Design a protein around this nucleic acid. Structure first.
Ligand SMILES: [Mg+2]
Ligand SMILES: [Mg+2]
Ligand SMILES: [Mg+2]
Ligand SMILES: [Mg+2]
Ligand SMILES: [Mg+2]
Length: 213
DNA sequence: CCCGGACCTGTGACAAATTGCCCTCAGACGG
DNA sequence: GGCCGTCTGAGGGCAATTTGTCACAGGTCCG
């Protein structure tokens, strides 16, 4: 029924810092690019509004501010760093935006891959929870279940979590619990976890999950 | 022995950021 | 033909929530 996103695992596991609105736009770019060699994409205000159930006004606000916050953002594949954009965005027509993605990023988008339908993620609010749901999809089985152990330091590096979450009680309270709650409340996935320890330090988080069925 | 100290946990406060809402007014189009 | 009524969207804002930071209470073990 709805668009099927696929992406190279290299993007799922890349290190970057994007907002919710920026990640939403990014899903459409990957969709446009894949359906084809030059990197120029386009976004319609009225289409964006309908996809994510926004008004035209608030859509316009989200696109405009997302777009100017890309400047200077960089992407690291573990390592190699790239800018997302190589030219400012611009609007030829009212309600229409044209963007220039770094053509050297194309092969990192299309490659060992991750896939999900866009309806699975479009109600998630916290961008770190989008990152977690993407990493879990990378390990999902056809039937809809999976289990994976992710290292905490790698979680911090890849999702570029803010500095105070290196204190484990803050990591638990403001990142782990919240994002597990959203996934359980906003996606068709049912997720559980347990902590792996070594001495006094907690080193990994072990995720198990199934599908509504 | 128990100390001060270096670790770990959780919670109460506050500061900074993001959310969906609300209102104005000109652009683009067709009847 | 050309004006105007309507559908858009580009601006300006808001209070209510969520996210990011740090002080302090309270556990263990070390030598
Ligand atoms: Mg952010
Ligand atoms: Mg917004
Ligand atoms: Mg005493
Ligand atoms: Mg007490
Ligand atoms: Mg004490």
């Amino acid at each position: 029924n709805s668009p099927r996103i696929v992406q190279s695992n290299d993007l799922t596991e890349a290190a970057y810092s994007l907002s919710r609105d920026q990640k939403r736009m990014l899903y459409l770019f990957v969709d446009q690019i894949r359906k084809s060699h030059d990197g120029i994409c386009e976004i319609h205000v009225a289409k964006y509004a309908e996809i994510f159930g926004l008004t035209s006004a608030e859509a316009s606000k989200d696109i405009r501010q997302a777009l100017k916050s890309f400047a200077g953002k960089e992407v690291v594949f573990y390592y190699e760093s790239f800018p997302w954009f190589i030219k400012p965005a611009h609007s030829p027509s009212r309600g229409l935006y044209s963007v220039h993605i770094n053509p050297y990023l194309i092969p990192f988008f299309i490659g060992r891959f991750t896939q999900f339908r866009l309806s699975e993620t479009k109600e998630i609010t916290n961008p770190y929870a989008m990152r977690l749901y993407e990493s879990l999809c990378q390990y999902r089985k056809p039937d809809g279940s999976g289990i994976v152990s992710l290292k905490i330091d790698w979680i911090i590096e890849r999702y570029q979590l803010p500095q105070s979450y290196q204190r484990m009680p803050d990591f638990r309270r403001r990142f782990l619990q919240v994002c597990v709650n959203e996934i359980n409340s906003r996606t068709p996935m049912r997720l559980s976890y347990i902590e792996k320890k070594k001495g006094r330090q907690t080193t990994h988080i072990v995720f198990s999950f199934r599908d509504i069925t």
